[PDB]
């Protein structure tokens, strides 16, 4: 058993693509965001948000459009035929600027299921009352990561599905678990070390974790399934560093789901008549942050990636997703409702919380052309056909079929006839999925020398740009 | 005089790869779940601290033809697979879990005490928990990993053992089975037999025998085919210092101290044990998600896997995170109560395996045949060389038997579908038989194998 | 430069805004009222080396 | 579009400047300051 030949066996993109002599650069001015860490702000009666909820632990999703190269002529354009071919951008090198002074922030919750210290107890604990929840906080696991590619990052989380039907689920049963892939959206939450799942559905208490994560589903990248992609065009590249360690050890307090079989211990008495709750969970503790482990503010250079794409961004489209814990510092300020009285009182001062956010993007690019034959056309049309539309061969156009001449009938709409609405804006199927946006379309320049970043690109390859006089 | 396998074996030009989709496991850390009256398990007991044992079958190469098969005689020879390189994928977000026990023999703090301790009552055990030693290891070879543990033997008969005596100790090898427990830093032994209290350690280990690899005896194998390769990293440090509380087995001879009085009239228990404490975990010391490349190993096997069989055993502490969720039996009432919420505990598990392989042939002579037959002769069975002429002249069929005139009562020869004699030893299983492919380029892993040796990316 | 955490405290003063209830469940008794939401870390210098 | 090139290039200083053979040095004796940390 071979068994047959054709696959056609996806190939290294560097086969048919050719690299040119020209480079460009452009970048945003910069980005800043402001928003309360813990919950969004909205008018109490309204649903309209007064202030957006933002914190470092929110993921970031950057989408970047490029203008079509093939609209964009050249100083000397003769070197190719724009008819028989196309032009497509390529991404050589990438930078992420971050300017805030480095410092750790933090979160907590006013009510948290807890019994007492498990580390040292002189005597056995007290009787469990109702609602011993307390106000306690902790630091999240420190983390840095980076993600680059033409297709959105693919997420995963724990989650509940439907139990197979034999036993009817009664209230209080253990809901079965299911592993679920999904697209990643902005505002979603890093792991705290409690793992990707839906607290909202799976945690009824709603008090079992600090606020920020109680609402949504923390998610985490699966390198496997992603890198597993046949084209790799999900992500072609990445970096990560993270660390954590233990601090405290606590107990849940609530109805015991199941009691350990006795044979695993021996009956107590008196103070030991009853068994304390079995549960335990750690308190994650961030560690010493250094200027070294910062993965940013330093250039990157790509040549070969695990995927077959080499820095090709199809459809003028490019994705970057980056998350930092290091800048999480939360400044806190106070306003005085009465400036006169000279006796200090806790009454006079309201308190608010705002958190800073600082990004910048600067992207090198390289320029490339593509020859067309059948095999070419075929091979593409297999990969993603939508790509073809925004290009023009030729269209196909329709060997793939033509519309049958939509009915246009002269009617005031007051005639007895149906509505008609002139159609077709939508170019993005993913418009369902919201996330942060920036447009670069205008910013390109043809001379590296004038930018801070680029001249390094020179320096790496040397080669005086030719400023002689 | 055992020889280097690379003597007689020859290496071919062809490579393949296949791998599982992924592996996924769910279970509760602390004890297994079963119907209360029944013995049948409702939910399997699983936690990261359980060892993992992977058994992998390969299809017989010599059933598997080639695009061009001419280059050898399949009659005079055979084909046997070789394992060049190996990967272990792990996908969970990294985080530390934990365990405890509700009742634990303890006196009080030994670190600082203002005044002498109180009088020993009955059962001061308390609810206290701890973190286990962080650890990473990896194991690869064609024979199962050999374990060792402390354990009780039979005392020599001079003094009759009375209850309360010190049981003598025995050092015991055994085969390693799945579900077995890492050391916590308390050493490999049987608590069940040697610890009567059963409360002296946190739950997970109380039942079974934690075990630990012996590099010596294993690597001591003459063929090395137990394991040909390995890596390990681990660390620990102290946190707290406690005391047992119970009947004193022996008192120190007085001469090693001076008599007390009053508060010091009596001697507090002598015992002490540390509380192990895991350290800061880093993304660096992770040994996984990174390729490996083997050429020479300490044993004479060079990546030979006999009998189409191969073993991998891997254990991590880093993913031990235990998520905890709550279900509401009554969704209506708006006043919070500890009554409404049951609690459950489930723990995640994620594995993946991807194995390079190389293809190899064997010439035969007597010396050849002899030398193998010495090593393991069972190997010859699954091949076709061994002959072994049979008998069997005549039979008597008497037909037919249900006809109730009594010819002899009948057929007794099932006994030999049996292939694995270790079928007694249970452990996790995966079948790859179907998954091979002939071209690296289409997989994430392999193309690195190319990159390491370069070679062409192949034309177009 | 470098830093790490040491202690975790609470502001005390007039609450600027209260979290919408739906993010938790009503207390009672000791839990009748919500403690202040704020937190801020106490930065801690580390071992200095030559 | 096509980019027009109305640019003067701003250039690496090492273009027009010329380096010499001579070097010098000078330095302060030392600096010394005293004060209270918390308020003037």
Q: Quickly list DSSP for B373-423.
A: HHH-THHHHTSS--------------S-STTSS-PPP------TT---GGG
C41 to chain A, minimum CA–CA distance in Å? 7
Touching subunits for chain D (3+ Cβ pairs under 8 A): A
A245: number of Cβ within 10 Å:
19
Record: contact B24-A287, CB cut-off 8 A: no
Q: Do at least 3 CB pairs under 8 Å connect D with C? A: no
In-domain check, residue B114: yes
Q: Is A444 on the interface with B (CB under 8 A)?
A: no
- CA–CA separation, B327 vs B344, rounded Å? 8
Largest CA distance in chain A: 95
Q: What SS3 state is found at A58?
A: strand
In-domain check, residue A182: yes
Q: Is B334 on the interface with C (CB under 8 A)?
A: yes
Q: Which DSSP letter does residue B369 get?
A: H
- CA–CA separation, A18 vs A13, rounded Å? 10
Contact A14, B459 (CB under 8 A): no
Nearest CA to A296 among A243, A244, A245, A241?
A241
Q: Is D17 on the interface with A (CB under 8 A)?
A: no
Record: contact B240-A15, CB cut-off 8 A: no
In-domain check, residue A206: yes
In chain D, whose CA is at the least distance from the CA of A24?
Answer: D3
Q: With contacts defined as CB-CB under 8 Å, which chain C residues touch B335? A: 26, 28
* Nearest-by-Cβ selection for A447 from D1, D7, D12: D7
| CA atoms lying within 13 Å on the CB side of residue A437 | 9
Nearest CA to A327 among A19, A101, A75, A30?
A101
Record: contact C39-A106, CB cut-off 8 A: yes
Find residues 355-414 of chain B whose CB sits inside 8 Å of chain A.
none
Record: contact C19-A39, CB cut-off 8 A: yes
A407: number of Cβ within 10 Å:
6
In-domain check, residue A37: yes
Q: Is C2 on the interface with B (CB under 8 A)?
A: no
Nearest CA to A142 among A356, A355, A328?
A328
Residue listed under structure tokens 């703090």: B109
- CA–CA separation, A50 vs A41, rounded Å? 5
Backbone phi, psi, residue A282, to 5°: -75, 165
Q: Do at least 3 CB pairs under 8 Å connect D with B? A: no
Burial of A89 (0-12, 13-18, 19+ CB in 10 A): buried
In chain A, whose CA is at the least distance from the CA of C14?
Answer: A350
Q: Is B335 on the interface with C (CB under 8 A)?
A: yes
Q: Is D18 on the interface with A (CB under 8 A)?
A: no
Q: Do at least 3 CB pairs under 8 Å connect B with A? A: yes
- CA–CA separation, A260 vs B48, rounded Å? 19
Residue listed under structure tokens 């235990």: B322
| CA atoms lying within 13 Å on the CB side of residue B195 | 24
* Nearest-by-Cβ selection for C13 from A105, A330, A349: A349
* Number of domains within chain B: 1
Q: Is B241 on the interface with A (CB under 8 A)?
A: no
In chain D, whose CA is at the least distance from the CA of A450?
Answer: D10
In chain A, whose CA is at the least distance from the CA of D7?
Answer: A447
Method of structure determination: cryo-EM
In-domain check, residue B306: yes
Q: With contacts defined as CB-CB under 8 Å, which chain B residues touch A191? A: 93, 95
Contact A351, C38 (CB under 8 A): yes
- CA–CA separation, B99 vs A282, rounded Å? 10
Positions of chain breaks in chain C, given as the residue before each break (C to N > 2.5 Å)? none
Contact A58, A328 (CB under 8 A): no
Q: With contacts defined as CB-CB under 8 Å, which chain A residues touch D15? A: 467-469
In-domain check, residue A406: no
Record: contact B31-A228, CB cut-off 8 A: no
Distance, CA of B4 to chain centre: 28
Residues contacting residue B285 through CB under 8 Å, at least 6 positions apart: B136, B233
- CA–CA separation, A271 vs A125, rounded Å? 9
- CA–CA separation, A72 vs A210, rounded Å? 51
Record: contact B278-A204, CB cut-off 8 A: no
Residues contacting residue B162 through CB under 8 Å, at least 6 positions apart: none
- Using CA atoms, how far residue A193 sits from A110, A282, B16, in Å, is 20, 9, 38
Question: Is the alpha carbon torsion for B105, B109, B111, B117 positive or negative?
Answer: negative
- CA–CA separation, A174 vs A302, rounded Å? 48
In-domain check, residue B79: yes
Contact A249, A119 (CB under 8 A): yes
In-domain check, residue A100: yes
Distance, CA of A357 to chain centre: 16
What does DSSP say about strands B54-57 and B429-431: parallel, antiparallel, or unpaired?
Answer: parallel
Which two tokens mark B267?
């001697």
What does DSSP say about strands B309-316 and B281-282: parallel, antiparallel, or unpaired?
Answer: unpaired
What's the domain range around B143? 5-378
C39 to chain A, minimum CA–CA distance in Å? 7
* Nearest-by-Cβ selection for B344 from A257, A266, A306: A257
Q: Nearest 5 degrees, angle CA A145-CA A232-CA A221?
A: 35
- CA–CA separation, B285 vs B430, rounded Å? 28
CATH classification of the domain holding B31:
2.60.175.20
Record: contact D2-A74, CB cut-off 8 A: yes
């Amino acid at each position: 058993y071979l068994p047959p030949v054709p696959v056609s066996k996806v190939v290294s993109t560097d086969e048919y693509v050719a690299r040119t002599n020209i480079y460009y650069h452009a970048g945003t001015s910069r980005l800043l965001a402001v928003g309360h860490p813990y919950f969004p702000i909205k008018k109490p009666n309204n649903n309209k948000i007064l202030v957006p909820k933002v914190s470092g632990l929110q993921y970031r999703v950057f989408r970047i459009h490029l203008p079509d190269p093939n609209k964009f002529g050249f100083p000397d354009t003769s070197f190719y035929n724009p008819d028989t071919q196309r032009l497509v951008w390529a991404c050589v090198g990438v930078e992420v600027g971050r300017g805030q002074p480095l410092g750790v922030g933090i979160s907590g919750h006013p009510l948290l299921n807890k019994l007492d210290d498990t580390e040292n107890a002189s005597a056995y604990a007290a009787n469990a009352g109702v609602d011993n929840r307390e106000c306690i906080s902790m630091d999240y696991k420190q983390t840095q990561l980076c993600l680059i590619g033409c297709k959105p990052p693919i997420g995963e989380h724990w989650g509940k599905g439907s139990p197979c039907t034999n036993v009817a689920v009664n209230p209080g049963d253990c809901p079965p678990l299911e592993l679920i892939n999904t697209v990643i959206q902005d505002g979603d939450m890093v792991d705290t070390g409690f793992g990707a799942m839906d607290f909202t559905t799976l945690q009824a208490n709603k008090s079992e974790v600090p606020l920020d994560i109680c609402t949504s589903i923390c998610k985490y990248p699966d390198y496997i399934k992603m890198v597993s992609e046949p084209y790799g065009d999900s992500l072609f590249f990445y970096l990560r560093r993270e660390q954590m360690f233990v601090r405290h050890l606590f107990n849940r307090a609530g109805a015991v789901g199941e009691n350990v079989p006795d044979d695993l211990y021996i009956k107590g008495s008196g103070s030991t008549a009853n068994l304390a709750s079995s549960n335990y969970f750690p308190t994650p503790s961030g560690s010493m942050v250094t200027s070294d482990a910062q993965i940013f503010n330093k250039p990157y250079w790509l040549q070969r990636a695990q995927g077959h794409n080499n820095g090709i961004c199809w459809g003028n489209q490019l994705f970057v997703t980056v998350v930092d814990t290091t800048r999480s510092t939360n400044m806190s300020l106070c306003a005085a409702i009465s400036t006169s009285e000279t006796t200090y009182k806790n009454t006079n001062f309201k308190e608010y919380l705002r958190h800073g956010e600082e990004y910048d993007l600067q992207f090198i690019f390289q320029l490339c052309k593509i020859t067309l034959t059948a095999d070419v056309m075929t091979y593409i049309h297999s990969m993603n056909s939508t790509i073809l539309e925004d290009w023009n061969f030729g269209l196909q156009p329709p060997p793939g079929g033509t519309l049958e001449d939509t009915y246009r009938f002269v009617t005031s709409q007051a005639i007895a006839c149906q509505k008609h609405t002139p159609p077709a804006p939508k170019e993005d199927p993913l418009k369902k999925y919201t996330f942060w946006e920036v447009n670069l379309k205008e910013k390109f320049s043809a001379d590296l020398d004038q930018f801070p970043l680029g001249r390094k690109f020179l320096l790496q390859a040397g080669l005086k740009a030719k400023p002689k006089f």
